[PDB]
Amino acid sequence: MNGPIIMTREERMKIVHEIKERILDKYGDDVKAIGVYGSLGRQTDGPYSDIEMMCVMSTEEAEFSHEWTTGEWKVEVNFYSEEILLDYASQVESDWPLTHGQFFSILPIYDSGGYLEKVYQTAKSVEAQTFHDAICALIVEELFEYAGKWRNIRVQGPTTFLPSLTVQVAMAGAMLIGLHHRICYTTSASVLTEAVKQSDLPSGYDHLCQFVMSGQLSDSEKLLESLENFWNGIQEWTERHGYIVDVSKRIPF
Template sequence: MQPYPVPTTREQKLAFARSVKDRLLSLHGDAILAIGIYGSLGRGTDGPYSDIELHVVTQDNVPIQGHEFILPPFKLELSSATVTEFREKARRIDDYWPIRSGSYVDVYPLHDPLSLFEEVKKIPLSVSDEAVKETMKQFMIWEPYETVAKIRTNRAEGNLGYLPTGATDLAWQTAKLIGLANRRYFSTRARTLTEAAAMASKPAGFSALATAVTAGELSDRERVYGLCEELWTGLNDWFSRLGISYMETELPF
């Protein structure tokens, strides 16, 4: 038995995915409405160490168990949902929308007699402007605002070792906001910062901090702190231009 991870070709992964599809259909038959590959293999951008991710969509009254396992040389994640659950997940709008949506848009069908994947791929991109802005507002409160407070607190207390972590968190959180604002999902988490920096609408200061994070140039703590402050100013100016206010003028209750 070979240790994992080991390189495999796209053809090998597709052949294994098809064998899994055949096994599932032999076990569950018509209870399964669709099986498709998502992730990098579904997009056709997989590398030699990419895993295999499968959607398995079932009739509403016949849920089946999902699995995540390693059968060398393959790692496979089998995400199972009833058809109602699958549509609801594709419709969900939250801070992970730019990360998750691609798994519903870029699907390589293995079994889809009802063209379900073609139908569902339109759902994530149909979210309203109001829903996007509300999600951005809530996420700004939940994450970036708190992250900047932690960055300032740790610098004030002399805990400069936290600054690279805080800067990375702030860049990652801002990238998700950029994906939301542009209605664009990322091809992979590994390219989130570079893809966000290339989008049309983004806050001033993001590209500089994203470049520092992706290049690993985080040893100069004061420079890192300055980049975070520049992005924070840019982030608030950007929200203002987008017409998103996340602060209250009085108690909301």
């Protein structure tokens, strides 16, 4: 295929409406509400942008999505039960700052009873603890691991992975930041640029983002240290912020 074509918000929107009409002809009374999320729902959609949408079903245990292309453009429509969506909107995870911005950006197209605010609010009312736990997990389950792989790279190679790991790591810290600050990033592309602006940034972070953002990830000696510094900027940050991981137990269970 020729890939994604240039379109206009106006064109995009007609599609939105076309699809909306189809959802209702098909499900009818089973449809509770329909929304536009992403760049479009934000009204910041670019020329090559896609259309993501989310639909709220009456129908229980409902969880499906329909994603397609016409060669020229692509669409994605997710359908959920009113429950399934709420629960989901209530989940803070390692990529929450990436995933959950979708709940504060909905562009309502059809609501039979304010389902869309409900959603938003729910997303909006997350307990602080939840975010803490999520930072903690992210460290054990993620940062730690990368730490290992990068220390082995030094040791036994390969550095052909170094450029890719760094990015992963650059990202990881950003989710770290966001979970900390209860922020969701605009898009996936604004992630680095927005993370590097926040306040209580771990020592070594910005410097790493430098590398990752400039594209100069060719010198593995340097990249090695940054990761190193960052990790240390982290051990600290955690202490001072209270996200202290339980190391104690050799056998957690």
